[PDB]
């Protein structure tokens, strides 16, 4: 949370989400991301360089999360048989 032209107030900058556009606050439970490994393709065999999605308390308790992850993953690629 900035003050003025871009002075830093603040204790830290929290994680956000894009499955419901709501911040992960402050020490909350059921808040974790999900590193899917990339594969380099064509020759196979995992190469880095994680794709990370941020999952909040809210989505998980409302049993959304399964579908959400696929929408997020597909939209930016890449998984075989899409």
């Amino acid at each position: 949370m900035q003050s003025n032209a871009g002075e830093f107030v603040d204790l830290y900058v929290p994680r956000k989400c894009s499955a419901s556009n709501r911040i992960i606050g402050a020490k909350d439970h059921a808040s974790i991301p999900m590193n899917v490994a990339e594969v380099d393709k064509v020759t196979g065999r995992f190469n880095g360089q994680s794709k990370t999605y941020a999952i909040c308390g809210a989505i998980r308790r409302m049993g959304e999360s399964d579908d959400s992850i696929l929408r997020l993953a597909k939209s930016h690629g890449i998984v075989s048989q899409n």
Partner: protein, 208 residues
């Protein structure tokens, strides 16, 4: 993705699926599993879409990969049919194994007679592994799980459509998972399938 032709499935898988009785589902209507469904069999029963089962299995597998220690993924089954299944998975992939009773508190309890440190849980039915599923969301752990059309979807991140109760259905999915993770990172390598048969998994199958 990976090398790519056999990751768009192949006949070999489609034969194994049909044999293991994966394809049939429940008769309860859906609102979170509904997308996955291929078509509905006459007078109830849903035919799951093998294409969807594939992609989810691969995304799951990929998440276990990019950890350089395979021990901190806990494979969990309390189902009888999947006790042998997870035991073989743990030999192969190098998972830390939980067959039979979970015994409440191993991701919780500072004072306990056992403690396990995972980073990702893989569950065979979260209405039988309900204790891990609840316990995991008290201590900030993501959980993949094998879900049918009447399993809870709350606190499950990535679901894999499948019957996943009884028979060879639980076995086969553990076999295919192990095969997949070994492809990306293992010693099957190069994104080609295992030389081990699914029959090493499955259930004990009463011995004559």
């Amino acid at each position: 993705s990976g090398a790519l032709d056999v990751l768009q499935m192949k006949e070999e898988d489609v034969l194994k699926f049909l044999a293991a009785g994966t394809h049939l589902g429940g008769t309860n209507l859906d609102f979170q599993m509904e997308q996955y469904i291929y078509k509905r069999k006459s007078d109830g029963i849903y035919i799951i879409n093998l294409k969807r089962t594939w992609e989810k299995l691969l995304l799951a597998a990929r998440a276990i990969v990019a950890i350089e220690n395979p021990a901190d993924v806990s494979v969990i089954s309390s189902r009888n049919t999947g006790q042998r299944a997870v035991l073989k998975f743990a030999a192969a992939t190098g998972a830390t194994p939980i067959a039979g009773r979970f015994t409440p508190g191993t991701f919780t309890n500072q004072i306990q007679a056992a403690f396990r440190e995972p980073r990702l849980l893989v569950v065979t039915d979260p209405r039988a592994d309900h204790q891990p599923l609840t316990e995991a969301s008290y201590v900030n752990l993501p959980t993949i799980a094998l879900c049918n059309t009447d399993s809870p979807l709350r606190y499950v991140d990535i679901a894999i459509p499948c019957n996943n109760k009884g028979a060879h259905s639980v076995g086969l999915m553990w076999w295919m998972l192990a095969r997949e993770v070994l492809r990306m990172r293992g010693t099957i390598s190069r994104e080609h399938p295992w030389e081990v048969m699914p029959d090493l998994y499955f259930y004990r199958d009463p011995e004559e």
